[PDB]
Amino acid sequence: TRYAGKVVVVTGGGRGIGAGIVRAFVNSGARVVICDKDESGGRALEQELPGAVFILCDVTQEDDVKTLVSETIRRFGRLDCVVNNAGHHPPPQRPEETSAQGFRQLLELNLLGTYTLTKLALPYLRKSQGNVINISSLVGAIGQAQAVPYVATKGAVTAMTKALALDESPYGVRVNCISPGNIWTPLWEELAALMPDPRASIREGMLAQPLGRMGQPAEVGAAAVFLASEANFCTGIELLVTGGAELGYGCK
Amino acid sequence: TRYAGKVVVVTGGGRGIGAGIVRAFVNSGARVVICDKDESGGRALEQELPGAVFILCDVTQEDDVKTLVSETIRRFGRLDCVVNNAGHHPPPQRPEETSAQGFRQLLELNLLGTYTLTKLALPYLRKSQGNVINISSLVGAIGQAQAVPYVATKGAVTAMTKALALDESPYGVRVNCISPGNIWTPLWEELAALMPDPRASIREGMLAQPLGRMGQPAEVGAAAVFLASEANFCTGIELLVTGGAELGYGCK
Amino acid sequence: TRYAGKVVVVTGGGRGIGAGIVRAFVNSGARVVICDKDESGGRALEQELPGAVFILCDVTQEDDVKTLVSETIRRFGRLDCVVNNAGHHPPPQRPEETSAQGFRQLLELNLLGTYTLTKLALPYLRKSQGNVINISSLVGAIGQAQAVPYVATKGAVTAMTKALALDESPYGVRVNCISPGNIWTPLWEELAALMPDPRASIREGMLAQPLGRMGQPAEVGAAAVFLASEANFCTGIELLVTGGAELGYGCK
Amino acid sequence: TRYAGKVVVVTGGGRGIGAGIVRAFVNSGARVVICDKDESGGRALEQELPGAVFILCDVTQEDDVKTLVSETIRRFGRLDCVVNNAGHHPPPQRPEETSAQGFRQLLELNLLGTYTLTKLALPYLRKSQGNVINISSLVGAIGQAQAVPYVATKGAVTAMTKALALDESPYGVRVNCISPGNIWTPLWEELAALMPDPRASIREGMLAQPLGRMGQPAEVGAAAVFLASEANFCTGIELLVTGGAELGYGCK
Ligand SMILES: NC(=O)c1ccc[n+]([C@@H]2O[C@H](COP(=O)([O-])OP(=O)(O)OC[C@H]3O[C@@H](n4cnc5c(N)ncnc54)[C@H](O)[C@@H]3O)[C@@H](O)[C@H]2O)c1
Ligand SMILES: NC(=O)c1ccc[n+]([C@@H]2O[C@H](COP(=O)([O-])OP(=O)(O)OC[C@H]3O[C@@H](n4cnc5c(N)ncnc54)[C@H](O)[C@@H]3O)[C@@H](O)[C@H]2O)c1
Ligand SMILES: NC(=O)c1ccc[n+]([C@@H]2O[C@H](COP(=O)([O-])OP(=O)(O)OC[C@H]3O[C@@H](n4cnc5c(N)ncnc54)[C@H](O)[C@@H]3O)[C@@H](O)[C@H]2O)c1
Ligand SMILES: NC(=O)c1ccc[n+]([C@@H]2O[C@H](COP(=O)([O-])OP(=O)(O)OC[C@H]3O[C@@H](n4cnc5c(N)ncnc54)[C@H](O)[C@@H]3O)[C@@H](O)[C@H]2O)c1
Ligand SMILES: Oc1c(F)c(F)c(F)c(F)c1F
Ligand SMILES: Oc1c(F)c(F)c(F)c(F)c1F
Ligand SMILES: Oc1c(F)c(F)c(F)c(F)c1F
Ligand SMILES: Oc1c(F)c(F)c(F)c(F)c1F
Ligand code: NA
Ligand code: NA
Ligand code: NA
Ligand code: NA
């Protein structure tokens, strides 16, 4: 009921955090368009959830995104919320091991893909007085070791969220972001598998939070539903979903 | 349904933001104890809302607060959430017009009252894996003119929220705060009435937000219900409910 | 030369960070009044440093502070900078082990002592277009375990710094703060000595910073001299002197 | 004397903030390499300042930057500090008026140019235990209207500064940034000239700060010299040089 009659697009919604956000919006009564560059997870999610449908779309391809928006409007008649979740964290890379071209590529996904869908969706969000939710990262705010390009892309997303919030406020379109800390997802598991001791890597990630565990996609999803449906006086905020990782002293 | 079977105490719940928080929790299915030093608003709210009851309590009086907690447990058998909302903003005061004793008095209400109820409630919150929500202010983070004591008390509340979150995390008790900006309440109206041109004061307060309006108690209430019921990986966060007042350049 | 002809008051200047700030200002060419409630360290510093003199003053005693200001003006004819450094970190205390009265006492030293000297000094700082520097703490911003009252007092100091900066900006008086992280001082050493394994406590404190060491009083002192003498467009800022402790993930 | 015997590279040092930073480091005793894509200002500065020399270099051209570093080492034998100041603020642009390609171009200058010089300089900074200073912007932290691409690039710079600080801390290389607010420069003047009422635009920019004026390049320069020469326990910090623009409520 909380978001009934509304239409939501979630990028990277085929697995991980994006899938948890898809589920949370379906559970709120919304119709959800799952956007993903990979077919496997998103196609299964459409079969599983009445009210969710899957559209293949690579957010780095401008024409893919144009088609995502026009098909969303053609099939559902309105657009109320865009969740820019698609993005990627590379394996650990020392600064001297990064490249300008790798940096540009990560910018294309983590930042410009968010920019392009938001831009194409804003005319419809203005009609609906809808809202934008960007999935950034805690490490955009506090930094991270061996991740100069990734951290830079999320710093940009969080800052862009505030600029856009200023620009769209006279039209009643809110723009917010969520900064998750360690969330247990296939990406986290993939990255842990590259480590010498994956179980040690995972235990270390759990202990980075005062709460002693990592977060869940469903917890990010509930934050997104709050921002969309109940946060009518929130715009340009950075909602931390981190288990307290930013608090207090730790072993650095 | 979202917070059914839960018991919530809201201090200063007789009017303004506190009353909006009371209403939001009742609408979520919780039973609510309205604490206030004034009888008029809170007594009427109890008559109006099934599931809410009023207990007279001045949060600066330690024995009042002891009785608030013990009566809450006696009457409802559990305690899941404490919302420390009671507090006051004095009229504008130049720094040379403040006094150490006025500062101590405002500290007693805005900070130590929050500290005392939280302390007395924590043994019951640990049993329920409940949570604490402190109502701070945006001006604790960014400052405000002619309000040195007030700003200082809210800086302390926001910082204390993070310290307590660290201490209580091994027990599964989350501690968060909400920082509202300009919310249209009887306090805001009272303060505007002291100005030479109250309508000019109010128009200026509306235009301090990119959204062009002040916030509502119900919007603070929805943020509080989110933190209590759906933010299980959030602890020690400062949730801004400000309409974007902190964003961008303005006339300073 | 950088602060020649200027007169600076440093509270708690008899040892630790305060003594490092005294030394830095003397080395810059300023005359320095060392305020401390203890005679031993401050008296020796006056004998050691030409241009520094010691005045016994407990910043929690309003009449002590009145005399500190009037004696500073009587002896040196002007007042350009007040460094509010006096303050104390109690031993670790679980929240249920704190008291309202202990909290009030720490507020008297860490917050109201800073407030009282600043208030009495502002008429002279206005004449000189001088400035105020408050020594807060990183843990006011990010929290700390087993330190609810301390963290709250430094949250208040940092917020008060911004409020005062707003109030005094039309008079050209800047108000800034420094937030040190772990600085190796007699206080740090005293607190480490209370731990079961003091050498383990100290090694843990060094490793809380990416730089792998604690900071020095002289490094806080150089930050203070910068704010006083060269930061003419800085007001209301929080200058972090923390070795990066706030950056990245750590063992929490 | 404060930075005697040291070698500093300042990008965009031919005018504006960069020229003020060049002057501040020369006045501190350092030798300075002025990098700029434009010959006019930087060539004159070399003639004016003994100890400063001009090297033509476009920071978006990787081979220009390779030559800048190798010529700095060839001519001066060491490299102690890199100030990444080159960058540009476009005219106001509504979000629907921006393009992905314009965004990529601004990223090339404001972000990747900083990344490329830092990367090529780090082997020499490690030898000297030198430091990096990035010139970001206050609007990366708080947002700005009609500047989505610009704000995003400075959000990235500030975040990248913290990531790099973490990576380089075990080598004793500090990485910090300065976030100026409104600084009176040829860029500010150029942008004001595009407005309908340039004098009204400028008066509005002065009043955006509680101090009632814009900042000077020399004030940014003094902050940079502090970070390089005296801030040995500061790494990953964001030093605000804004006149208090971020403080308090304003007309938004
Ligand atoms: N996992 C964490 O701890 C964590 C923490 C903070 C932020 N984040 C952010 O959350 C988001 C999701 O992370 P995750 O852990 O769920 O990752 P994930 O790898 O598990 O899932 C990402 C999904 O996005 C899709 N995707 C990738 N590139 C795409 C593209 N070009 N177009 C469309 N879809 C694309 C993938 O196919 C996948 O289904 C990312 O923005 C990530 O940076 C994650
Ligand atoms: N109104 C705003 O714009 C605004 C903005 C930011 C923060 N806040 C904070 O929100 C809270 C509520 O503000 P409001 O505008 O609703 O104020 P309000 O004056 O309208 O309501 C406050 C309520 O608290 C009660 N109260 C006061 N002192 C008390 C005490 N000692 N014990 C018990 N109850 C007591 C009052 O009787 C009243 O019912 C305060 O903490 C305030 O600082 C308000
Ligand atoms: N040491 C750290 O790691 C650290 C970190 C962050 C902030 N701080 C802050 O720095 C300041 C100094 O800390 P420190 O480690 O140098 O402490 P310290 O105990 O070594 O020195 C404090 C000095 O202040 C004096 N003092 C105490 N109470 C006083 C009073 N009422 N009136 C006058 N003088 C008084 C003491 O006699 C002593 O000379 C404090 O405000 C502290 O909170 C310290
Ligand atoms: N002026 C302000 O209010 C303000 C505020 C915050 C941040 N900043 C930042 O400060 C920096 C300098 O700003 P400014 O106002 O002095 O600008 P400016 O235009 O006056 O000076 C910039 C200088 O950089 C040079 N430059 C530009 N592109 C270059 C390139 N590709 N390679 C080499 N040199 C290049 C220009 O030729 C010029 O000499 C920028 O990073 C800007 O974003 C400025
Ligand atoms: O933002 C991320 C992210 F995407 C990940 F996949 C991580 F493992 C992590 F630690 C982060 F901070
Ligand atoms: O925190 C407050 C508050 F309580 C008020 F009543 C206000 F009017 C205001 F502007 C604030 F920022
Ligand atoms: O602020 C402080 C302080 F004063 C101390 F003495 C400490 F040991 C510490 F860790 C802090 F964060
Ligand atoms: O960062 C900048 C900048 F570069 C400019 F040129 C400006 F005019 C301004 F307002 C900013 F915030
Ligand atoms: Na379906
Ligand atoms: Na009732
Ligand atoms: Na002396
Ligand atoms: Na020269």
DSSP string over B133-180: EEE--HHHHH--TTBHHHHHHHHHHHHHHHHHHHHHGGGT-EEEEEEE
- Distance of alpha carbon C175 from alpha carbon D20, whole angstroms: 24
- Distance of alpha carbon C98 from alpha carbon B82, whole angstroms: 19
Rounded to whole angstroms, what are the CA distances from A19 to A8, A26, A27, A144, A222?
Answer: 13, 11, 12, 25, 12
- Resolution of the coordinates in A? 1.9
In short, whether B137's Cβ falls inside 6 Å of ligand 6 is yes
Residues tagged in the binding site annotation of A:
15, 17, 36-37, 58-59, 85, 150, 154, 183, 185, 187
Kindly give the interhelix angle for B113-128 and B62-76, rounded to the nearest 10 degrees.
20
Q: Which one of the listed residues A3, A115, A150, A171 is annotated catalytic?
A: A150
Measured in whole angstroms, the distance separating CA B125 from the mean position of its chain's CA atoms is 18
B154 lies within 8 A of chain C by CB = yes
Cβ neighbours of residue C214 closer than 8 Å, sequence gap 6 or more: C181, C182, C183, C184, C188, C205, C206, C243
Centre a 10 Å sphere on the Cβ of residue D203 and count the other Cβ atoms it contains. Answer: 11
Q: What distance in angstroms lies between residue B146's CA and the mean position of ligand 6's atoms?
A: 12
D97/chain C closest Cα distance in angstroms: 34
Between chain C and chain D, the number of residue pairs with CB atoms below 8 A apart is: 102
Paired tokens of B76: 């409802």
Nearest to A240 among B215, B234, B242 (CB): B234
* Ligand nearest to C-alpha B44: 10
Nearest CA to ligand 3 atom 32: C58
Q: What is the DSSP letter of D93?
A: B
Measured in whole angstroms, the distance separating CA A70 from the mean position of its chain's CA atoms is 21
- Distance of alpha carbon A207 from alpha carbon B63, whole angstroms: 39
Paired tokens of D79: 């490299």
Q: Looking at the DSSP assignment, which residues form a beta bridge with residue C183?
A: C215
Contact A220, A241 (CB under 8 A): yes
| Chain C residues inside the 8 Å CB shell of B112 | 100, 103-104
Helix, strand, coil fractions of chain C, as percent rounded to 5: 50, 15, 35
Paired tokens of C50: 């030409």
Nearest to B248 among A166, A172, A219 (CB): A166
Q: What distance in angstroms lies between residue A249's CA and the mean position of ligand 12's atoms?
A: 47
Question: C201 in helix, strand or coil?
Answer: helix
| Burial class, C228, CB count within 10 angstroms (exposed 0-12 / middle 13-18 / buried 19+) | buried
- Distance of alpha carbon C222 from alpha carbon C224, whole angstroms: 5
Q: Which chains border C (3 or more CB–CB pairs < 8 Å)?
A: A, B, D
Phi, psi at residue B177, to the nearest 5°?
-135, 160
Question: D83 in helix, strand or coil?
Answer: strand
Cβ neighbours of residue B44 closer than 8 Å, sequence gap 6 or more: none
Q: Is residue C59 annotated as involved in ligand binding?
A: yes
D150 annotated active-site: yes
Nearest to B241 among A169, A219, A233 (CB): A233
Q: Looking at the DSSP assignment, which residues form a beta bridge with residue D83?
A: D10, D133
Q: Is residue C58 annotated as involved in ligand binding?
A: yes
Paired tokens of D99: 């393009």
- Beta-strand relationship, D52-56 and D31-36: parallel
In short, whether B89's Cβ falls inside 6 Å of ligand 6 is yes
Amino acid occupying residue C60: T
Cβ neighbours of residue C213 closer than 8 Å, sequence gap 6 or more: C206, C243
Nearest to B17 by CA among B235, B189, B150, B207: B189
Nearest to C30 by CA among C229, C234, C235: C229
Nearest to C223 among D166, D231, D244 (CB): D231
Nearest to C140 by CA among C49, C38, C242: C242
Q: Which chains border B (3 or more CB–CB pairs < 8 Å)?
A: A, C, D
Nearest CA to ligand 7 atom 2: C137
Size (chain C), residues: 252
Rounded to whole angstroms, what are the CA distances from C43 to A213, B67, C75?
Answer: 52, 52, 17
* Ligand nearest to C-alpha D57: 4
Q: Which atom of ligand 5 is nearest to the CA of A154?
A: 1
- Distance of alpha carbon A24 from alpha carbon C67, whole angstroms: 64
Paired tokens of A121: 């969706």
Q: Which of residues 49-78 of C touch A (CB under 8 A)?
A: none
- Distance of alpha carbon A150 from alpha carbon C62, whole angstroms: 53
Residue that is written with structure tokens 């991270």 in the block: A144
Q: How was this structure determined?
A: X-ray
Contact B18, B36 (CB under 8 A): yes
Paired tokens of D116: 């490329």
Size (chain B), residues: 252
Q: Which one of the listed residues D124, D150, D171, D249 is annotated catalytic?
A: D150
A87/chain D closest Cα distance in angstroms: 16
Nearest to D124 by CA among D161, D89, D75, D158: D75
- Distance of alpha carbon B131 from alpha carbon B231, whole angstroms: 10
In short, whether C174's Cβ falls inside 6 Å of ligand 7 is no
Q: What distance in angstroms lies between residue C69's CA and the mean position of ligand 11's atoms?
A: 18
| Burial class, A201, CB count within 10 angstroms (exposed 0-12 / middle 13-18 / buried 19+) | middle
Ordered alpha helix ranges (H), A62-210: 62-76, 100-107, 113-128, 138-142, 148-168, 186-193, 198-207
Contact B155, C179 (CB under 8 A): no
Contact C102, C157 (CB under 8 A): no
Gyration radius of chain B over CA positions: 17
Phi, psi at residue B195, to the nearest 5°?
-75, 155
Rounded to whole angstroms, what are the CA distances from D184 to B99, D212, D238?
Answer: 39, 13, 20
Q: Which chains border D (3 or more CB–CB pairs < 8 Å)?
A: A, B, C
Size (chain A), residues: 252
Ligand 2 test: best mutation among B66, B185, B209, B242, most atoms within 8 Å of CB?
Answer: B185
